[PDB]
């Protein structure tokens, strides 16, 4: 019922399983196991997250599944298909973010213009 | 949980005979059953897993079969080393539960 909570900042992708509350959580990607001591890239699974490092669009992308300990890989609730590009530090423009920048810039422009107006007036 | 039972606690068979041991389950366990062999001195080893796949180092003498809720281990010719207690363990749902075991 509760979807995955994936927070993407910079080149590291972190995704969370807020569906199995208090059990050990494992991960599988493209039906291949990821996490758990594997030396490659040090993708270190923690209590309820999976932090990819220097995410690769072509190497690391596909179905991600979250099964609790004591449950088979095929018994998890639902898969997740994650297809993203990462940068060194790119940040998105949502509608609210663009509205914020438009408002703040028009405000500062008007304010400074009128302040110079008033100062020059006297 | 899932109560895992066996038909007979002990059975007797002569040397060189093909012997089968039955294990039942309270629910369907999706063939997620493993058979364990325990020597009388205390050491115990895994014979087969997933009801059909032998384990590395276990002789092909041991074969498992069955599906659903009835599973069976069919030993081939019985040597003297083959006398032991055999345990069947589920793997379907937590907690894992063993059975009483059969003394061969």
């Amino acid at each position, epitope marked *: 019922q509760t979807p995955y909570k994936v927070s993407i900042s910079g080149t590291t992708v972190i995704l969370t399983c807020p569906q199995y509350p208090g059990s*050990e959580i*494992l991960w*599988q990607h493209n039906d291949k196991n990821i996490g*758990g001591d594997e030396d490659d890239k040090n993708i270190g699974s923690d*209590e309820d997250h999976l932090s990819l490092k220097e995410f690769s669009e072509l190497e690391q992308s596909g179905y991600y599944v979250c099964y609790p300990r004591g449950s088979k890989p095929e018994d998890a609730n639902f898969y997740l298909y994650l297809r993203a590009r990462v940068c060194e530090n790119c940040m998105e423009m949502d509608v609210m973010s663009v509205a914020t920048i438009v408002i703040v810039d028009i405000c500062i422009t008007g304010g400074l213009l009128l302040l110079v107006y008033y100062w020059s007036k006297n | 949980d899932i109560q895992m039972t066996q038909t007979t606690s002990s059975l007797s068979a002569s040397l060189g005979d093909r012997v089968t041991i039955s294990c039942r389950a309270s629910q369907d366990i999706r063939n997620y059953l493993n058979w364990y062999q325990q020597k009388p001195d205390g050491t*115990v080893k895994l014979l087969i897993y997933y009801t059909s796949r032998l384990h590395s180092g276990v002789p092909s003498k041991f074969s498992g079969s069955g599906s659903g809720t009835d599973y069976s281990l069919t030993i081939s010719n019985l040597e003297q080393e083959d006398i032991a207690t055999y345990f069947c*363990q589920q793997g379907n749902t937590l*907690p*894992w539960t063993f059975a009483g075991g059969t003394k061969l």
Partner: nanobody
Amino acid sequence: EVQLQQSGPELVKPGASMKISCKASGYSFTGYTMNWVKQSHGKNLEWMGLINPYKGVSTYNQKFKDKATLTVDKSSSTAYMELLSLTSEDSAVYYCARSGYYGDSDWYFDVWGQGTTLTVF
């Protein structure tokens, strides 16, 4: 070869706490799940809980959640069970069983230890 070595008999007075050590060797200890099983009532085998050595987390059988607390010493390649409030019904042979890390190989115990015979009197 792969081998798990355990502790000895260690008779314990009732009411105490008794730490069982399972020393793993011959393989990457941080990559394989370790389980613990109990052989009481003559020959009946039961399961307590499994501890993930790399992360140190544990999942327990409902019966033994108040009876055992498991710790791992990653440096020495050992697993520890803490048996607290040791009554007379706790006297049995205790095995430490290895199994695969992930959900596809953690439901069968490939490598078993010799077992420690705990006697409580």
